[PDB]
Amino acid sequence: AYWNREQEKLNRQYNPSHLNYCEPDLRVTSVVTGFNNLPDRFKDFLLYLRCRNYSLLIDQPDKCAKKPFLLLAIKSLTPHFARRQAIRESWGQESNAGNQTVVRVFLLGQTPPEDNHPDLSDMLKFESEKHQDILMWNYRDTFFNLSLKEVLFLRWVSTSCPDTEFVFKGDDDVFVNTHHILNYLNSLSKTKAKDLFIGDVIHNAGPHRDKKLKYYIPEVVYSGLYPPYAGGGGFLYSGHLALRLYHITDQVHLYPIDDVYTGMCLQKLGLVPEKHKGFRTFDIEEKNKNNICSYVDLMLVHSRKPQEMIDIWSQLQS
Amino acid sequence: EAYWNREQEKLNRQYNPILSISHLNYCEPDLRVTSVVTGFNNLPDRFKDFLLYLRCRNYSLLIDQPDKCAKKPFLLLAIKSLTPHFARRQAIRESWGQESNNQTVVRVFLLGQTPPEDNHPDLSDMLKFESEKHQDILMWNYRDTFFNLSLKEVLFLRWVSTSCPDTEFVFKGDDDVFVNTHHILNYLNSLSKTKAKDLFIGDVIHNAGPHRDKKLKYYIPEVVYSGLYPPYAGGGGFLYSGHLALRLYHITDQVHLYPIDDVYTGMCLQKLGLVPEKHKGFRTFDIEEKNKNNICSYVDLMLVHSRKPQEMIDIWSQLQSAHLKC
Ligand SMILES: *[C@@H]1O[C@H](CO)[C@@H](O[C@@H]2O[C@H](CO)[C@@H](O[C@@H]3O[C@H](CO[C@H]4O[C@H](CO)[C@@H](O)[C@H](O)[C@@H]4O)[C@@H](O)[C@H](O)[C@@H]3O)[C@H](O)[C@H]2NC(C)=O)[C@H](O)[C@H]1NC(C)=O
Ligand SMILES: *[C@@H]1O[C@H](CO)[C@@H](O[C@@H]2O[C@H](CO)[C@@H](O[C@@H]3O[C@H](CO)[C@@H](O)[C@H](O)[C@@H]3O)[C@H](O)[C@H]2NC(C)=O)[C@H](O)[C@H]1NC(C)=O
Ligand SMILES: O=c1ccn([C@@H]2O[C@H](COP(=O)(O)OP(=O)(O)O)[C@@H](O)[C@H]2O)c(=O)[nH]1
Ligand SMILES: O=c1ccn([C@@H]2O[C@H](COP(=O)(O)OP(=O)(O)O)[C@@H](O)[C@H]2O)c(=O)[nH]1
Ligand SMILES: *[C@@H]1O[C@H](CO)[C@@H](O)[C@H](O)[C@H]1NC(C)=O
Ligand SMILES: *[C@@H]1O[C@H](CO)[C@@H](O)[C@H](O)[C@H]1NC(C)=O
Ligand SMILES: [Mg+2]
Ligand SMILES: [Mg+2]
Numbered sequence: 048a049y050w051n052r053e054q055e056k057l058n059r060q061y062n063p064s065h066l067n068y069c070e071p072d073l074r075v076t077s078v079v080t081g082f083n084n085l086p087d088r089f090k091d092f093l094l095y096l097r098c099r100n101y102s103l104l105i106d107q108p109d110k111c112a113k114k115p116f117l118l119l120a121i122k123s124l125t126p127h128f129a130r131r132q133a134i135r136e137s138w139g140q141e142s143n144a145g146n147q148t149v150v151r152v153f154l155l156g157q158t159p160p161e162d163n164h165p166d167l168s169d170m171l172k173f174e175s176e177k178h179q180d181i182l183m184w185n186y187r188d189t190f191f192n193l194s195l196k197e198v199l200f201l202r203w204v205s206t207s208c209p210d211t212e213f214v215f216k217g218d219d220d221v222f223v224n225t226h227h228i229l230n231y232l233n234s235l236s237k238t239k240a241k242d243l244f245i246g247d248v249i250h251n252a253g254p255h256r257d258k259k260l261k262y263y264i265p266e267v268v269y270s271g272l273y274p275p276y277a278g279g280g281g282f283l284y285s286g287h288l289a290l291r292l293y294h295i296t297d298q299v300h301l302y303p304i305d306d307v308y309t310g311m312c313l314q315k316l317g318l319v320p321e322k323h324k325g326f327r328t329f330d331i332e333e334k335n336k337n338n339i340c341s342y343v344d345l346m347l348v349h350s351r352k353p354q355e356m357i358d359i360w361s362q363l364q365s
Numbered sequence: 366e367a368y369w370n371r372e373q374e375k376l377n378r379q380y381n382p383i384l385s386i387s388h389l390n391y392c393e394p395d396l397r398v399t400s401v402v403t404g405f406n407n408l409p410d411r412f413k414d415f416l417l418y419l420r421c422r423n424y425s426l427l428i429d430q431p432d433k434c435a436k437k438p439f440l441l442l443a444i445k446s447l448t449p450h451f452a453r454r455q456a457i458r459e460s461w462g463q464e465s466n467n468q469t470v471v472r473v474f475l476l477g478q479t480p481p482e483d484n485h486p487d488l489s490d491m492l493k494f495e496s497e498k499h500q501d502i503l504m505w506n507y508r509d510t511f512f513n514l515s516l517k518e519v520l521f522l523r524w525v526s527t528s529c530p531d532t533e534f535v536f537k538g539d540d541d542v543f544v545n546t547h548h549i550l551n552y553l554n555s556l557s558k559t560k561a562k563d564l565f566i567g568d569v570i571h572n573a574g575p576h577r578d579k580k581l582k583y584y585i586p587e588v589v590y591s592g593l594y595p596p597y598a599g600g601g602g603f604l605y606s607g608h609l610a611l612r613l614y615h616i617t618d619q620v621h622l623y624p625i626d627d628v629y630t631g632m633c634l635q636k637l638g639l640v641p642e643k644h645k646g647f648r649t650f651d652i653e654e655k656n657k658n659n660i661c662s663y664v665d666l667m668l669v670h671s672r673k674p675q676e677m678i679d680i681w682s683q684l685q686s687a688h689l690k691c
């Protein structure tokens with residue numbers, strides 16, 4: 048498998064370019080058997096795997112001027128204006144209660160015209176100027192570039208928010224019980240809090256070989272099993288681990304699934320993420336969707352629409 | 366026995382002397398319906414809201430484009446949309462919904478309110494910025510819901526009569542369909558004066574009935590509506606003359622609002638003595654699968670349902686040279 052072989056090469060190089068080679072890696076079309084018959088997203092991933100020095104087009108350099116207790120980092124796409132606004136008004140509110148600063152950033156790439164995306168750049172600039180919470184990098188925002196979104200976000204944390212006590216990274220289609228998370232973080236002993244990483248962790252998972260699935264991975268790309276990883280909509284970790292995570296990203300090749308890439312970085316650090324039952328990545332039962340007390344005892348639910356996020360958050364306040 | 370049918374019968378008696386509280390601007394709750402409609406308390410909330418406020422339709426225009434038709438348009442594009450649908454509207458602006466010219470084509474998006482009381486995110490400042498930039502937003506001060514779409518129809522027809530009465534033709538459609546606007550212009554220019562005067566074409570269905578399955582999107586209880594629907598064009602868009610648009614609005618006062626907007630339009634057409642015409646170019650159920658990847662499939666149709674914003678821009682881009690390939 049290509050990724051396995053290339054990761055083995057990377058280990059040798061770091062125990063005596065893959066970071067700023069941004070020309071097409073034309074060799075992959077010869078080393079990967081059946082390359083021409085692969086879907087375009089795999090072609091783009093393999094051809095441009097070795098480039099990750101993308102620039103920040105929209106920054107919020109003063110987002111963490113005061114040391115945050117919790118940084119909310121939400122992955123989003125340019126046209127998702129309603130999702131971002133509902134998060135701003137509901138569980139993603141910035142706050143300062145009890146000297147525990149909560150700050151919010153949305154993580155965006157480019158939706159370029161070459162991919163037939165509508166030009167929403169002026170709307171995005173208006174949103175950025177109004178809400179001061181948009182981080183946007185100059186790369187093609189795609190599913191297979193989400194591990195790139197992860198690395199560039201971790202880079203931003205190291206340069207612009209290195210002192211945040213904890214980090215929540217999640218999707219813009221989940222409801223998050225931020226009160227439950229804050230109570231959980233404040234209940235942690237210093238021992239568990241230093242290297243906290245929790246979520247919906249699955250062990251001994253493998254790459255999907257069914258070509259019809261969303262997260263299909265060919266045998267020529269990756270072989271073997273996945274490391275333990277938290278996926279399904281969000282995970283929570285300490286700022287200390289965020290710095291260790293970013294430092295190790297150079298030593299791990301990007302992977303088409305961002306949550307698997309994060310698990311690889313944790314495994315290279317010698318850490319095992321812990322499953323927490325409050326991460327309901329497969330939603331809750333049907334009858335309980337409109338029972339607010341079913342949201343009291345969990346961290347997040349996947350998935351909810353913008354209107355539902357505001358409605359649940361409103362009822363949650365009482 | 367059905368509520369809408371009985372109330373429409375009362376309305377017919379008022380407007381037709383041969384058959385021998387306002388229904389247009391009473392905007393308090395019609396508290397009588399909770400006793401006259403059997404099982405009212407067990408109806409879904411959208412039916413309760415529909416029945417309680419049926420007699421109100423004098424809603425105000427919050428965002429207007431009063432000079433949209435300062436030059437006599439040949440074709441007015443009116444697209445139904447919701448506040449958060451920024452990507453759909455922008456893709457339409459860049460592709461098939463471009464305004465163009467001596468055949469003026471103009472574009473408006475038809476919006477209601479997505480109020481905070483209904484837990485909608487506050488996107489009002491974004492919408493105002495969008496309106497100031499593109500000048501194609503029409504927004505009325507009513508609750509924008511599926512069962513209020515016939516209100517969107519009535520209020521749009523009112524705007525045509527007051528602000529765009531001289532447009533030669535009107536296309537009303539959804540913000541999730543691709544429209545071959547070139548094909549529509551060629552079709553309109555091929556019309557005789559006789560056929561063009563009362564043009565109304567689309568995906569017309571005859572002898573359709575209300576869905577009684579409580580789980581379906583367009584479910585209608587037996588206590589609300591009985592019998593069959595009139596012939597009506599639905600499924601994503603229809604095309605008609607501006608002369609007929611004025612006749613359509615004039616008759617709206619004589620027809621009670623209905624929870625399905627396209628059925629309401631068919632009711633108005635039937636009251637005028639007109640029958641909408643089926644046109645094969647309205648592909649409301651999409652095209653075949655392999656044909657989706659052939660731009661030649663799009664050169665000889667009016668619209669396709671449905672397409673995403675990127676797909677709209679991609680198809681429109683390939684259509685500009687389809688005359689060389691097809
Ligand atoms: C289509 O759009 C219509 C216009 O937006 C919608 O009509 C609105 O419907 C809402 C309910 O969804 C009504 O709001 C309710 O009003 C009643 C009565 O409030 C009045 O009386 C109370 C005291 O009893 C007083 O405090 C208020 O100031 C009012 O004078 C309340 O009891 C409810 O709690 C709720 O506020 C709107 O009044 C009504 N607006 C108008 C202009 O008619 C309609 O619902 C939409 N239809 C569909 C199918 O979605
Ligand atoms: C992840 O994001 C990166 C950066 O946006 C993407 O790399 C870019 O990929 C496009 C193709 O999708 C490249 O454009 C192409 O360049 C070749 C050069 O021969 C040309 O033949 C094509 O017509 C097209 O212009 C672009 O150069 C490249 N940018 C950089 C800086 O490398 C990448 O595709 C994204 N990956 C995934 C899996 O989506
Ligand atoms: O190209 C993309 C696709 C998705 N996302 C974000 O990734 C998260 C999860 O996406 P999705 O719900 O489609 O994936 P799934 O739940 O099926 O794993 C959402 O916040 C999206 O906005 C993104 O940032 N870029
Ligand atoms: O409350 C609403 C709901 C829908 N729409 C518009 O109605 C059109 C068709 O709606 P949809 O595709 O969701 O329904 P369909 O009849 O295709 O199942 C679209 O342009 C929507 O933006 C609207 O204007 N207000
Ligand atoms: C990254 O580095 C390479 C050279 O190492 C350079 O050519 C490229 O422009 C840089 N930036 C981007 C956006 O790739
Ligand atoms: C409609 O008209 C009635 C009486 O003229 C008025 O009471 C009502 O408020 C109006 N509805 C509006 C402006 O929404
Ligand atoms: Mg999701
Ligand atoms: Mg539709």
